Design a protein around this nucleic acid. Structure first.
Length: 77
RNA sequence: UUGAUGUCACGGAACAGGAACUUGAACAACAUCGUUAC
């Protein structure tokens, strides 16, 4: 019914990560959740204990692919 | 550990001001050590 395509990205430069926020101040009114939306995120299991790993939102990769498609469709009319 | 119809964060130089400085003839004469004797 569905087909899975596994991808992997590899960096050539030191990337940048954002801070950890709480589940309350995670809306459009906080000025630290915005301005940190184009970076990687830090997920910590069992909150109130800084122990976890980084990850990357899939919506950000979707937006980048959309921008690349917009820029590639204007070259072939 | 995201949710979708809308992310210019490669949109932003850790930058800007503060004398390791001040003072000094490579020169020269009087002793050191304690007890003996009635």
């Amino acid at each position: 019914m569905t087909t899975t395509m596994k991808i992997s990205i590899e960096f050539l430069e030191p990337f940048r990560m954002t801070k950890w926020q709480e589940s309350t101040r995670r809306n459009k009114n906080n000025k630290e959740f915005v301005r940190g939306q184009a970076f990687a995120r830090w997920h910590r299991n069992k909150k109130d204990n800084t122990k976890g790993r980084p990850y990357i939102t899939g919506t950000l990769l979707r937006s980048a692919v959309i921008r690349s498609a917009e820029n590639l469709l204007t070259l072939s009319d």
